[PDB]
Write a protein that binds this ligand. Structure first.
Ligand SMILES: [Cl-]
Length: 294
């Protein structure tokens, strides 16, 4: 699995701040927009993009405060990310897109699709955010950890002061061992502890046990939209998974319209690090049939 990042930087200024993004592939079609989550960046897509770039433009932003993007002193609520990504998409002049989304990138992508349904030609998703109505729906191995993350004292100590999301949660949610070169790519944006705010606010925003209410409501709303939308969907899942365990993926296969599921084999949360070639090759071969407007 490749460790390098052979993509030239692009930057766009939106809402006073620079956002970095990958931008490769032809300009004359429907672009494929890749949205990472916590605590990753466009680096997460590095081994997937090469499968898609031959046929389609690939745009992979680093969320505000992450990756090579600027670091405004924000609270980094989901709403901040919504504002910055909305402005990013308009700044690039995107019209119709295909979404390829993960984790908080999936909350962003599904929320954007619900608000802009005529502009979404397909959604490839994996390990995406849905409501967890109670803590029992959250995977047991990660329950005490995330309960601790979602506190103002211990959670800040673990994530900000000890870098637990980068040093702990990230490699623990890849089945294969991440290499030190890969870890250094993930560490780079967060070498200074104070810059870890987004990494702590994100788990505090997850819709778990009814809290925070605003996020629960908006995730319910995009899920209601998704269940009624005819848009083509491609859902990748692994075993045992984290947010989408195998039985959940099978329920979604049946309960989402026009949904193809792809079993990637062993996987926890960061499925892209366990089987990038299957994810990329399956996305690439699924794109052509999305083109036609019927
Ligand atoms: Cl999170």
């Amino acid at each position: 699995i490749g460790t390098g990042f052979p993509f030239d930087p692009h930057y766009v200024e939106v809402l006073g701040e620079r956002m970095h993004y990958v931008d490769v592939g032809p300009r004359d079609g429907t672009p494929v927009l890749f949205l990472h989550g916590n605590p990753t960046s466009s680096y997460l897509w590095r081994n997937i993009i090469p499968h898609v770039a031959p046929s389609h433009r690939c745009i992979a932003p680093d969320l505000i405060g992450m990756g090579k993007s600027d670091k405004p002193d924000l609270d980094y609520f989901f709403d901040d990310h919504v504002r910055y990504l909305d402005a990013f998409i308009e700044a690039l002049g995107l019209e119709e897109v295909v979404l390829v989304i993960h984790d908080w990138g999936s909350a962003l992508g599904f929320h954007w699709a619900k608000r802009n349904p005529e502009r979404v030609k397909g959604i490839a998703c994996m390990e995406f955010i849905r409501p967890f109505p109670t803590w029992d729906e959250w995977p047991e191995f990660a329950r005490e950890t995330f309960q601790a993350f979602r506190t103002a004292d211990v959670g800040r100590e673990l994530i900000i002061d000890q870098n637990a999301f980068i040093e702990g949660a990230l490699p623990k949610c890849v089945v294969r061992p991440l290499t030190e070169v890969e870890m250094d790519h993930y560490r780079e944006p967060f070498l200074k502890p104070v810059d870890r705010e987004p990494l702590w606010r994100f788990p505090n925003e997850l819709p778990i046990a009814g809290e925070p209410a605003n996020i629960v409501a908006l995730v319910e709303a995009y899920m209601n939209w998704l269940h009624q939308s005819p848009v083509p969907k491609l859902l990748f899942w692994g075993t045992p998974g984290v947010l989408i365990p195998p039985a959940e993926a099978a329920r979604l296969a049946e309960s989402l319209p026009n949904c193809k599921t792809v079993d990637i084999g062993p996987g926890l949360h960061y499925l892209q690090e366990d089987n990038p070639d299957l994810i990329g090759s399956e996305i690439a071969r699924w794109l052509p049939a999305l083109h036609h407007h019927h």
